[PDB]
Nucleic acid binder design. Structure first.
Lengths: 186, 149, 82, 206, 82, 129
RNA sequence: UUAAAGUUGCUGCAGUUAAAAAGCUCGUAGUUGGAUCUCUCUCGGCCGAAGCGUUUACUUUGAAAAAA
RNA sequence: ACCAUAAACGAUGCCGACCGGCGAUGCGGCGGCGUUAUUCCCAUGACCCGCCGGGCAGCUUC
C-alpha cells in the first residue's frame, strides 16, 4: 500500500497502510481500494496543538482517490483522533535549466513539471471538495507576499474548520502564506 | 482594431475562471472522443464540432474534459484535413468571388474585395510555411485555386 | 530641510492636503483648513476639542472636497458607518 | 453623528422630513451627488436617503459649532424661498445673514464698506448662489451648501443632500440645522422639543 | 470617484459591466436543462445556442437559434444548471 | 498594438497620481512590473498592491500614497555601463538628494544606488521621483 | 570654423491656421512586437586534469594595447 | 482606352494605453411596470423605462 521510490516505509506509513487495508477488508470500497496505493505520509504541527496528516498519492492515481476522498477522510479521522487528513499528489519539480547544467537535461522539461505549476496544483487538491474561484496576491510593505484563495461557497460548511490546517500545510510543503476566504457571490 | 477593416469591436468569447468539468456532466473523455470521431466523418470542421458539442451535449470546453484540443485529437487519430480550416475557408471565399466576378466584369467592389481576400491568404500561408504545416513550396495561384476546394 | 549637523534650515514647513497629500502652497487661496467639532458621548454637547482637515484648492475645484471631507471624517468616527 | 445614541434621528424628525418633502429630489442626477440617493423611482424622481441627509447635517453642525465667535459664520440665500429662513437662522444662532443679491466683490474687494471676512459660508443653493461660492475660492473660506440632486459640487465642502426647490423643505432644513447648532452648544437641551415651531422659517408667498 | 475600492466592487456592479471589463472576466451564458412536454428526456442546452437542438426521442425542435439567446418552443420547461 | 507593457503601467500610475486618486488598476500584469513596483514601494513611493489572478494575465490594483511626482519608462532599454551612470542620472533625476533610476542588472532589478553598491551595470528600465 | 543653434533636434525641434500629413487601400525589405518556465565524469594529488551548460547580445573582471 | 489631378480639406499620418461629465441618435444583445394590433393566450411587431457593446455626431468644464 506504501510503495515509495526509495523503497522504505516508516511508522506513519505502516499505521496508514494498515488502516487502508482495514477498509479493504470491511468497508464496501474494496473495488476502489484494491487498485490504489499511497507513496508517503507525514504528520506536521499546525496551530499549536492541532495535528494534520499528509497522505501522498501518485499523480496517475490522483482522480481515483478524488471519487472516494470524502468517504475516506471521515473514516480515517474516526480511526485516529481529531486530525485533519489531506491527500496530495507526489509531483516532481525539475529545476530551471541554466548556463551551467548537466546532460541529464536532454529533453525539455514539460510545463507541468515546473515550480509554479506544482505549487498551483498542490493548492488545487488539498482543498479538494471545494474549488478555487479566485486568487489574490497581496505584496505587503516589506516585500513579502500573502496569497488569498477564494473557495467555493457551495462546500463552505464542509471545509470551513479546515482552513487553519490548510494554511499550515501549504506553509509546510511550499513555504508561502495563504489565507482562505469565501465570497458571498461571484 | 481589425486588420483589413477600419473598425474595432469587443465581441468574443469569455471563458470562466474554473477549469474543471461541471459535476452534472456525465460524459468521460473517451466517449467525448468517440463523439468527435463520429462527427468528423461528416466533413465537419473543428470549429463546427465544438459548436455541436456545446449546444446539444453540455461540453463547454473539450480541453477541460479530455485534456486536449479538437485538432490535436483529429490529428493524432489521423482524421485531419490536408490544409487547415481557416486557410481552407479563405480559399473557398476567393473561389466564389472569382466565380461571380467572371460573370460580372464591371463589379469593381468585388475586384477590390478579392485583393483583400487574396492578400490575407498569402499572409496566412506564410505563417503555416514557417511553422511547417504546409510544405515549403505550396503556392496559392488563381489557376489552381478552384481545384484545391 | 536638515543639514549634516542636524539644524533645521527652512523658512517654514508647509501643510499638506489631508485628502491627496499635495503641498498646499503659499498663494493657494482656494485651499481650506476646517475644524469639525468633537462632542461628549453622553450629552451630545461640544466637548472643546476638534478635528482639523486641510484640503487643497485643486480638490475643491474638482468638486471632490465633499467626498474627501466625508471619508476623512468617517475614518475618525465622526460620521458613523452607513 | 458618530454612532451615538444621543444623536440618532428620532421619529418626529423623520415625520417632518416626510411631511415637507425633503426626501424627493429632482429629475436629474449629478454624478457628484450619487452617493446620497436611495434609488430613482418611477416618474423619474430620485429619492434622497434620509440617513445620509441626517448625517451630513450633523457634520455641518459640528463645523458651525467649531467657530468661537458666532458672527463669523455667514448664511446666504439669493432666492426668495430661502430668504426668511436665513434671517431667522441668524437670530437664533448669531450668524451674519445675507439675503437677496450677493454683491460681487463682497469677499475680495477690501476697499468697500460691503467688505466682510467670514470663516464659514452656508449657502441655500449652490446653483443660485454661484457667486459667493466662487469668491470663497479666493479667501480660503470653507463652504456648506444645501444640495439637490442636480446641484454641482465645485467648491462646496459639506454637501447636505436635501430638497431645496420646495418652500417647506428649505425652511425645514434651516430650522433643523439651527436646532442642531443650538443643541450642540451649551444651550437648549436634547430632552424637550424646541419652542420655535418650524413654520417661522417658511416662505409664504402672496 | 477619486476614492473607489477597485478590489471589492459591489456584486450588482460587476453584474452591470461588460463581460470582459469585469475584475475577473466571466460569461453571461449558462447551461439550461430543457424538458420536452410530450416526452420524458431531459436535455442539456446552451443558452446562447446556435443550430437547432432536437430531442432524439420525439424528433421535435427544442430551441430555434436567434441573434443572442436561443428561443425555446412553447411549453418546454427548463432549469438553469448550478 | 500594445508593445512595451511596462510603459502602459507607468503611464497609468502617473496619470492617476496626478488626478489625486487613491487606487489604479493596471492590466496586464507582468513580472517586470511587479519587480519595478517593489522597488518603488520599498523606498516609500506607492504602498501595498494586490495582484489579481485571472488565468490569462494578471491585473494589479496599486494603492497610491500621494508622494509620487513622476514615474517614467526609458525606451529602448539601453545598455548602461557603470561609468555611464552619472550622465543618466544627470539627465533624468531632478536632484542628487532624491530620485531613483531602475536598472535591470544580472543581479536582479534594482535601483541605481544599489547597483553601484553591488558594483554592477545593466540596462535601464525607467525612473521615479 | 566652433559655441551661441532646442535654427538639423540621439539626448532635443516641428507639420489645423506661421514652412509643412502622401487621394485611398493593399503590400516586400527595414524597424517594432502580449502574458508564461525557481552541473558533472575517469585518472593525478576531499579537490584539479575530461566534458561543458543550447547559442549569442548584455554586464563586471583580467591582459593586451608606442612615445609624444 | 489613356490621363491620376483638386480648399483631393477635419485646411488635422496610422496602431496602442491612460485621462471629466451630460443628453440624444443608429445597429445588435440583455432586462423591465404599463399602452396598442394579430380576437383570448403566449409569441411577436409600434411605443415607454433602463443596461451593455462598437458607431455618426453634439453640448459642457480651471
Amino acid at each position: 500500500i506504501v510503495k515509495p521510490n526509495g523503497e522504505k516505509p516508516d511508522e506513519f506509513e505502516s499505521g496508514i497502510s494498515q488502516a487502508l487495508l482495514e477498509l479493504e477488508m470491511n468497508s464496501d470500497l474494496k473495488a476502489q481500494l484494491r487498485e490504489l496505493n499511497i507513496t508517503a505520509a507525514k504528520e506536521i504541527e499546525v496551530g499549536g496543538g492541532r495535528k494534520a496528516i499528509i497522505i501522498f498519492v501518485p499523480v496517475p492515481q490522483l482522480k481515483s482517490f478524488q471519487k472516494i476522498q470524502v468517504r475516506l477522510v471521515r473514516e480515517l479521522e474516526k480511526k485516529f483522533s481529531g486530525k485533519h487528513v489531506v491527500f496530495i499528489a507526489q509531483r516532481r519539480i525539475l529545476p530551471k535549466p541554466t548556463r551551467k547544467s548537466r546532460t541529464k537535461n536532454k529533453q525539455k522539461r514539460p510545463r507541468s513539471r515546473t515550480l509554479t505549476a506544482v505549487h498551483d496544483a498542490i493548492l488545487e487538491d488539498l482543498v479538494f471538495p471545494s474549488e478555487i474561484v479566485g486568487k489574490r496576491i497581496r505584496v505587503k510593505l516589506d516585500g513579502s507576499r500573502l496569497i488569498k484563495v477564494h473557495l467555493d461557497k457551495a462546500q463552505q460548511n464542509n471545509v470551513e474548520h479546515k482552513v487553519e490546517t490548510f494554511s499550515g500545510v501549504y506553509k509546510k510543503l511550499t513555504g508561502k502564506d495563504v489565507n482562505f476566504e469565501f465570497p458571498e457571490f461571484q | 482594431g481589425r486588420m483589413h477593416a477600419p473598425g474595432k469591436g469587443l465581441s468574443q468569447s469569455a471563458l470562466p475562471y474554473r477549469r474543471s468539468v461541471p459535476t452534472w456532466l456525465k460524459l468521460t473523455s473517451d466517449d467525448v472522443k468517440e463523439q468527435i470521431y463520429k462527427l468528423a466523418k461528416k466533413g465537419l470542421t473543428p470549429s463546427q464540432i465544438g459548436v455541436i458539442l456545446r449546444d446539444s451535449h453540455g461540453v463547454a470546453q473539450v480541453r477541460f474534459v479530455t485534456g486536449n484540443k479538437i485538432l490535436r485529437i483529429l490529428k493524432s487519430k489521423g482524421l485531419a484535413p490536408d490544409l487547415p480550416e481557416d486557410l481552407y475557408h479563405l480559399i473557398k471565399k476567393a473561389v466564389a468571388v472569382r466565380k461571380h466576378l467572371e460573370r460580372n466584369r464591371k463589379d469593381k467592389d468585388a475586384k477590390f474585395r478579392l485583393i483583400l481576400i487574396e492578400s490575407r491568404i498569402h499572409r496566412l500561408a506564410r505563417y503555416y510555411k514557417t511553422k511547417r504545416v504546409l510544405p515549403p513550396n505550396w503556392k496559392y495561384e488563381s489557376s489552381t485555386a478552384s481545384a484545391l476546394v | 530641510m536638515q543639514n549634516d549637523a542636524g539644524e533645521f534650515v527652512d523658512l517654514y514647513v508647509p501643510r499638506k492636503c489631508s485628502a491627496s497629500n499635495r503641498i498646499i502652497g503659499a498663494k493657494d487661496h482656494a485651499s481650506i483648513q476646517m475644524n469639525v467639532a468633537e462632542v461628549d458621548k453622553v450629552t451630545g454637547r461640544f466637548n472643546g476639542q476638534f478635528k482639523t482637515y486641510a484640503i487643497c484648492g485643486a480638490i475643491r475645484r474638482m468638486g471632490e472636497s465633499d467626498d474627501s471631507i466625508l471619508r476623512l471624517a468617517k475614518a475618525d468616527g465622526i460620521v458613523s458607518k452607513n | 453623528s458618530g454612532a451615538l445614541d444621543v444623536l440618532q434621528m428620532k421619529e418626529e424628525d423623520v415625520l417632518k422630513f416626510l411631511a415637507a418633502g425633503t426626501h424627493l429630489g429632482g429629475t436629474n442626477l449629478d454624478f457628484q451627488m450619487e452617493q446620497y440617493i436611495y434609488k430613482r423611482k418611477s416618474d423619474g424622481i430620485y429619492i434622497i436617503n434620509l440617513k445620509r441627509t441626517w448625517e451630513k447635517l450633523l457634520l455641518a453642525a459640528r463645523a458651525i459649532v467649531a467657530i468661537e465667535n458666532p458672527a463669523d459664520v455667514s448664511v446666504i440665500s439669493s432666492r426668495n424661498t430661502g430668504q426668511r429662513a436665513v434671517l431667522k437662522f441668524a437670530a437664533a444662532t448669531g450668524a451674519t445673514p445675507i439675503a437677496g443679491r450677493f454683491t460681487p466683490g463682497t469677499f475680495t474687494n477690501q476697499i468697500q464698506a460691503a467688505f466682510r471676512e467670514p470663516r464659514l459660508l452656508v449657502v441655500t443653493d449652490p446653483r443660485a448662489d454661484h457667486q459667493p461660492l466662487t469668491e470663497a475660492s479666493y479667501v480660503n473660506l470653507p463652504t456648506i451648501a444645501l444640495c439637490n440632486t442636480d446641484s454641482p459640487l465645485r467648491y462646496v465642502d459639506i454637501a447636505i443632500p436635501c430638497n431645496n426647490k420646495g418652500a417647506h423643505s428649505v425652511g425645514l432644513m434651516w430650522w433643523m440645522l439651527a436646532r442642531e447648532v443650538l443643541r450642540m452648544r451649551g444651550t437648549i437641551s436634547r430632552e424637550h422639543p424646541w419652542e420655535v415651531m418650524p413654520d417661522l422659517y417658511f416662505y409664504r408667498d402672496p | 470617484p477619486l476614492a473607489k475600492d477597485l478590489l471589492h466592487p459591489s456584486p450588482e456592479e460587476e453584474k452591470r459591466k461588460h463581460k470582459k471589463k469585469r475584475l475577473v472576466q466571466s460569461p453571461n451564458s449558462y447551461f439550461m436543462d430543457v424538458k420536452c412536454p410530450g416526452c420524458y428526456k431531459i436535455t442539456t442546452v446552451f443558452s446562447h445556442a446556435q443550430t437547432v437542438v432536437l430531442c432524439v426521442g420525439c424528433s421535435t425542435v427544442l430551441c430555434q437559434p436567434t441573434g443572442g439567446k436561443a428561443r425555446l418552443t412553447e411549453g418546454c420547461s427548463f432549469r438553469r444548471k448550478q | 498594438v500594445r508593445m512595451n507593457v511596462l510603459a502602459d503601467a507607468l503611464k497609468s500610475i502617473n496619470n492617476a497620481e496626478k488626478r489625486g486618486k487613491r487606487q489604479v488598476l493596471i492590466r496586464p500584469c507582468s513580472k517586470v512590473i511587479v519587480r519595478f513596483l517593489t522597488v518603488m514601494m520599498k523606498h516609500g513611493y506607492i504602498g501595498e498592491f494586490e495582484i489579481i489572478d485571472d488565468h490569462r494575465a494578471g491585473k494589479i490594483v496599486v494603492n497610491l500614497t500621494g508622494r509620487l511626482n513622476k514615474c517614467g519608462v526609458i525606451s529602448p532599454r539601453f545598455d548602461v555601463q557603470l561609468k555611464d551612470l552619472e550622465k543618466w542620472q544627470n539627465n533624468l533625476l531632478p536632484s542628487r538628494q532624491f530620485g531613483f533610476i531602475v536598472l535591470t542588472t544580472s543581479a536582479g532589478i534594482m535601483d541605481h544606488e544599489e547597483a553601484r553598491r553591488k558594483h554592477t551595470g545593466g540596462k535601464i528600465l525607467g525612473f521615479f521621483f
